[model samples]
Target: QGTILLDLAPEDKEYQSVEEEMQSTIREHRDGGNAGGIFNRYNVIRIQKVVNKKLRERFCHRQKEVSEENHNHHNERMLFHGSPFINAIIHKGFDERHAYIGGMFGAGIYFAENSSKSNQYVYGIGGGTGCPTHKDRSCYICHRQMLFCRVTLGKSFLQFSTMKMAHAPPGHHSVIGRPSVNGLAYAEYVIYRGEQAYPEYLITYQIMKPEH
Candidate 1:
């Protein structure tokens, strides 16, 4: 599979806003809002299927080339030591900005500790969208009325560790005036290590649910 490099700056306004929105939307949905629940159910299933399909396709496309390296110890190691991480943030009664920013930092710490390894690599995947209320056709994540963020982390473990960090979670939400109602965030990291061209894959998932 081809590896793509990503460089996200935590200082970027757009990135910060999106991260905050992700936290807010997730919390809203989990709290039992009609729109939030529906959106979560649809997105959770859709995103999972999309990700799995992409992985399968990538694996199949590389199968032939992979087999050509007969007894290749490096390739085997690469395949044996790959890992992936998953995380999410949900906002609550605090300021959205603070919650989002805190969540992002929390995610980084989680990645550093869980994915750290001299020889192994780490990759991250993240994305989120706002749920929609029946009164509005627009999705909450996309709707200007509500904030939302969608993000994903994918690549070789080494590539991820080397990539620049995305913007730190937002410290303030412009819409809410004072700050976010509350914030929630979580993260997971995968570690890949071994001696083959491909590394072995390990996966982890983490989350910070709403406080209330």
Candidate 2:
């Protein structure tokens, strides 16, 4: 039900590795170009939640079933999940019942392999179009968080269009939304079950002001 967050020091190996991953992702998207603002990481916290016996049990059951059927590995991934409601999410985990029904794919919990894709959600959720006006003549720095989660992508169903369904298609464990010629800019992974994801790390960051 509840969760504990352990902040990792900048020197921590785990923090260093995840930070490198974030920077690489940003560079890949060219969002952290010479003229663009930089993503300054403030903290990397490890999330520890009390195990949900039944939920975890079911997830494992499905994992085994899918792996056997597909004759592949677990197909797990560490993906990005961003939102303004970080506290509630960490406390209770991802719940599709409370998810947005109008999601591009469906009412499932969405994850992105690319940090920039998830960053859009964080920025949009904050409701700030541009930097806030400050009396101190300094650019306003905005803080936001993105969750790096362990996702079970076993036997995923790849789709290029929307299918607002309650669950993945028969025989599939998750949905992978691929970008079309004129559609999505990035791929989105959606899981109908909350237990399919584990909020492993929380990365808090801010946009550095561009220099004059």
Candidate 3:
């Protein structure tokens, strides 16, 4: 019915809200520990439609099933996923074949509850952190992109250490990689089912490297 990503105008309230939320998220993480760097948001685009209607239907069905089985803890959360091929993910959804992290938590699409962790994987068309100014012509081309996704973690299998399993343990629906253990600095969420997630927003930002 519409384009995959509907660009949100700078003056739009939704755009501003997303921007503020991102800043607050960065602040919250930075106060606890190093949050990678300062992030300057360039744009926020709403994902107007689910790429696959059947997938959406299946996801909703799964949510209902989990709600009944787990006594209402479907465990849906908004997470970040940095992508190089932004359009592909926006249009076709996540696929393990395109996973660039070598399936550290299994051959699945990985997500980060913290934005900084996701930024590490961001790669845009003409990528670079530096720009003369936010409004400068070069800024648009240099900005990095990532997705804010709604993930349905029906019954997550919390893995304290890394595992090479093909999917979540038999009954579980997703995997949660705990932080500060197994040499992990940030939390990692892995979902093997593409139908379990919906890409909600496309965020373009400029990363300001922290001073040494």
Candidate 4:
């Protein structure tokens, strides 16, 4: 829950590789320092795998808590949001008497925007605007703000290969390398395709919280 010490197993290749690279160079320009970061690509869900594994080792109870305005809004963003990452869910917890308050994972899709900001990555419905679809549910202005806040987008471009070629519907949309629902990468099309339609991280979470 706090300060998870993730020392991988002797055979943890991916973890070890990333960790080594992390300790190496490329560990610069992080917004928070000591190079703190959030992976817009292959993000949360990967961590979810290990976190779930750790929790299930014991106190994995059958209790849960819904979203509420309390001290855990941060975690709520992780759980309370809907349409999870391709692997984030479809997804909970328990601990000592100190009784811990972790809960369950649920259904969801993809998110086009990181409402939490540098805060967090992707948590809205995917498609056309490359902006979140759900934020509109809370404040209509949230919708406009999202588009306003995004990196600039371009119209179209050519995609080619040693074999075939075609014009990309869109040529812009920063941070366009990550995956969307069903694991599709379509930031350009989603942001500039005019219709603003595309698959996404179908979401459904309760946020990381405790039932009091």
Model 4 segments more than 4 A misplaced: 1-8, 30-212
Q: What is the C-alpha lDDT of each candidate?
A: 0.23, 0.65, 0.63, 0.23
Q: What is the lDDT of residue 53 in candidate 1?
A: 35
Query: TM-score for each prediction?
Result: 0.19, 0.76, 0.71, 0.19
| Model 3 spans with C-alpha error above 4 angstroms | 1-3, 27-55, 97-103, 124-141, 209-212
Which prediction has more favorable lDDT, 3 or 4?
3
Greater-TM-score candidate between 3 and 4 = 3
Q: Give lDDT tens digits, candidate 3, residues 1-212.
A: 33344677767787776667665555334423222334443344332323456546666886787667667888899888775666687766666565433335566777887665666555421223323344232333456667788898888888765457667788788888886643566677888877677777778676554446
| Candidate 2 structure quality by residue, lDDT tens digits, 28-112 | 3333322223443333334232344454565577667667866777788999887666667776777778775563557788888
* lDDT by residue for model 4 (1-212), tens: 42222334535675444323222322222243111122222122121122334333221121111112212221211111222232312112211111111221011111233333212332322222322544322221221111111111222222221111111223222113233454432221112211112111121111121134
Q: Pick the candidate with the highest TM-score.
A: 2
lDDT (0-100) at residue 84 of candidate 2? 60
Task: Please give the TM-score that candidate 4 achieves against the real structure.
Answer: 0.19
| Over 4 Å off, model 2 | 27-72, 103-105, 123-140
Better of 2 and 3 by lDDT: 2
